[PDB]
């Protein structure tokens with residue numbers, strides 16, 4: 119019942135008690151581990167609200183106070199009355215920061231308490247949503263000095279009036295299937311790019327076209343909007359060694375802003391909650407540039423380096439992969455856009471992990487996602503045993519809207 | 526109950542029915558996942574069902590399930606259990622069990638080779654000296670002048686737990702590690718504790734950076750004895766880099782035979798506590814873990830210096846760059862000397878095919894993603910985007926405690 123975790127690089131052992139407060143389920147059993155699987159009413163709601171309020175008033179040293187009891191009573195009434203309820207501003211802020219704190223797959227959680235929450239719960243329209251988002255993008259970008267942010271649109275009611283951002287990120291490049299049979303732009307965004315056109319987007323069929331926003335308000339039909347270009351900060355990619363690098367014509371955007379997840383606080387469901395931080399270098403360099411199902415430029419880069427691509431054992435893919443990533447980090451830092459390298463990030467996470475064990479009795483962590491997609495064993499998280507479990511408040515996946523939308 | 530896994534690079538979906546034959550536990554619950562935890566005397570009362578489960582599998586695989594040969598064997602073993610409180614496997618059974626324990630090793634990326642395992646039956650061995658002789662024959666055969674073959678040597682099963690055969694070494698071939706009074710370590714830090722024991726047990730340590738540890742072998746529960754593997758039997762490869770002439774001057778070499786000897790082989794409830802087995806190295810085992818881990822030879826720095834890398838900011842990725850060159854060197858040195866080795870791209874590639882085939886013909890393939898994915902270049906290998914199901918099948922390779930912690934010393 120009281121679990122321990124060893125770091126096999128440092129012999130350090132932490133003890134985990136926090137997992138005892140786990141509510142949701144993991145996918146695994148005593149018979150089968152699913153750790154590597156990508157995606158594993160009035161009576162329902164009150165205990166959920168109660169759990170949240172209990173941990174909320176506990177965090178502000180007012181557990182069992184009149185304020186506490188009052189609030190429990192107030193929400194109880196509202197639930198019994200309205201079959202839902204509304205979070206105080208303070209609770210909303212707390213829940214959001216804690217949903218990030220509890221994200222077991224996020225290596226960047228040391229920053230968790232420094233989260234800016236924009237309350238867009240008074241939003242009614244897709245134009246409204248667009249305004250709130252533009253403000254989010256401008257705030258978080260900050261001329262390259264990135265600040266973490268979340269913007270929270272109204273909570274789901276009866277699933278009929280859902281707010282949704284259809285884009286997977288606020289800022290992503292377009293993806294077009296070609297007559298050549300290949301794929302122009304971003305392969306991950308092909309199907310989306312179609313629905314954009316299906317709702318009327320005038321695609322400038324290019325390779326690095328910033329997608330339009332496709333916003334759905336109150337369960338209505340989604341609408342298109344173009345993010346003002348001067349709010350979309352981009353970084354031209356150049357190698358601090360290879361002058362020929364720039365000739366590959368690569369850029370990436372500075373703001374990673376995930377906009378397709380569902381934020382759960384005290385049983386309430388926020389289906390539109392776009393949030394942002396800054397990149398870890400490998401996210402663009404390894405996954406965005408080199409993945410087979412993405413911009414897959416490895417061959418080209420290795421070719422220009424004239425590596426021996428005849429045999430896998432020359433490790434030419436490896437050699438290039440590093441250069442590419444060195445450049446990503448190089449450009450971003452040159453242009454003074456915030457970015458973190460996998461070395462610094464993972465180091466910061468081990469620290470945070472120790473802090474959380476010390477100040478909270480645990481830290482749920484998904485090793486499969488915390489270990490960066492390159493140089494794994496030369497970062498400190500590789501030899502860190504981790505425990506994975508689900509705390510609430512939380513960020514959850516949710517179905518792609520087109521599959522769900524009552525049109 | 527069916528389970529589907531998906532590959533997110535290729536959208537290939539596979540269905541696992543084999544996990545239904547899972548016996549042992551994973552360490553996980555519905556409330557917690559321990560998939561990244563390193564490590565998550567048996568009565569007749571429980572032995573026969575284990576024997577039966579095993580014998581059933583075995584007779585299915587030879588297509589004689591429910592045959593008379595099958596039933597008499599079940600009767601033979603039953604009778605021998607209540608009679609003798611244990612039982613002996615036929616050779617046919619031992620070979621099968623061993624191949625299958627490998628085949629079930631959910632952490633092993635080299636399993637495509639599982640059926641070509643050479644099994645040496647050392648169950649007639651009675652003494653440490655005998656153990657040495659068997660081991661030498663293993664090393665010689667497995668090595669085969671650089672053309673490595675898979676092998677496992679199997680010593681007598683455990684009985685009352687008081688007469689165990691053990692190989693105290695973690696691997697048959699390994700370099701000594703010596704702690705110095707200034708706190709620094711000469712040799713392989715992973716082996717410091719074990720080196721001390723050897724020295725204590727009488728070993729005369731040359732005290733260099735690459736001393737081949739002596740074998741420390743326990744028979745029938747007796748105190749272990751030292752033996753030196755004949756050097757002519759220990760194949761080694763000097764590490765040089767194909768472009769970098771200064772690399773050879775780093776003074777590095779490694780052995781060619783990865784031969785793990787501290788595990789436990791479980792077949793049909795029988796426990797084989799000394800079962801050294803061997804394959805060949807995937808390059809990153811030496812290149813990434815054995816050299817570049819902070820708790821090992823830790824040559825990243827020196828290689829980086831000699832490359833003239835900006836080691837001032839980690840944002841320079843000097844660690845990454847040097848790590849790759851070192852791995853390039855390891856593969857180069859090995860292939861130059863015609864000593865069998867595999868790179869992580871080829872190995873992970875082969876695994877995916879093995880896996881897909883295992884799903885078709887066996888209805889599943891237990892796989893531990895945390896261990897299958899290589900310690901560098903993870904996402905540019907096909908296994909990274911591969912979803913996997915982890916579960917334990919028997920026969921299996923299990924961990925056991927270090928014998929120096931459990932051994933009752935005779936004197």
Ligand code: HEM
Pocket residue numbers: 217218221223224225226227229233266267268393394395396397398401405458463487513
């Ligand atoms: C500020 C610096 C941040 C960094 C460096 C960072 C880094 C990362 C990385 C590397 C991943 C793995 C994704 C991949 O490998 O491509 C991840 C996942 C995740 N991040 Fe963080 N993040 C940051 C901020 C945030 C913020 C502000 C939030 C929300 C408030 C957040 C919530 C999450 C969640 C929920 C996941 C898991 C996504 C999933 O399950 O698919 N992160 N993050």
Ligand code: HEM
Pocket residue numbers: 627630632633634635636638642675676677802803804805806807810814867872896922
């Ligand atoms: C023949 C070529 C082989 C290759 C390339 C190979 C590769 C590997 C690698 C890279 C690992 C992970 C070790 C690490 O990450 O440091 C591993 C684990 C393992 N291998 Fe294989 N192996 C081979 C042969 C064998 C053989 C012959 C057996 C047994 C008969 C075997 C049984 C195992 C087991 C049980 C593990 C997991 C050990 C543990 O749980 O700690 N392997 N293998």
Ligand SMILES: CN(C)CCc1cccc(OCc2ccc3ccc(N)nc3c2)c1
Pocket residue numbers: 156374376394395396397398401
């Ligand atoms: C839904 N699946 C098809 C895709 C899931 C997936 C795949 C690859 C990376 C993912 O990361 C999501 C994610 C979420 C939040 C982030 C916050 C900051 C940051 N730098 N990256 C972040 C990345 C998710």
Ligand SMILES: CN(C)CCc1cccc(OCc2ccc3ccc(N)nc3c2)c1
Pocket residue numbers: 563783785803804805806807810
């Ligand atoms: C007990 N833990 C502290 C360490 C166990 C461990 C750690 C790292 C690698 C390990 O490798 C096991 C192992 C077993 C069999 C192998 C067969 C062939 C091969 N190339 N590597 C093989 C590797 C074991």
Ligand SMILES: C[C@H](O)[C@H](O)[C@H]1CNc2nc(N)[nH]c(=O)c2N1
Pocket residue numbers: 126500501502503504561562563895896897898899900
């Ligand atoms: C903490 C973690 O379980 C441990 O360090 C594991 C991680 N993954 C690994 N993966 C491989 N292939 N080999 C290892 O030794 C380890 N070590």
Ligand SMILES: C[C@H](O)[C@H](O)[C@H]1CNc2nc(N)[nH]c(=O)c2N1
Pocket residue numbers: 154155156486487488489533909910911912913
């Ligand atoms: C199959 C596997 O679950 C999937 O490819 C995961 C593996 N680990 C990952 N880890 C991170 N950080 N991001 C990812 O997208 C993935 N993908």
Ligand SMILES: [Zn+2]
Pocket residue numbers: 146147150151152153553557558559560
């Ligand atoms: Zn699990």
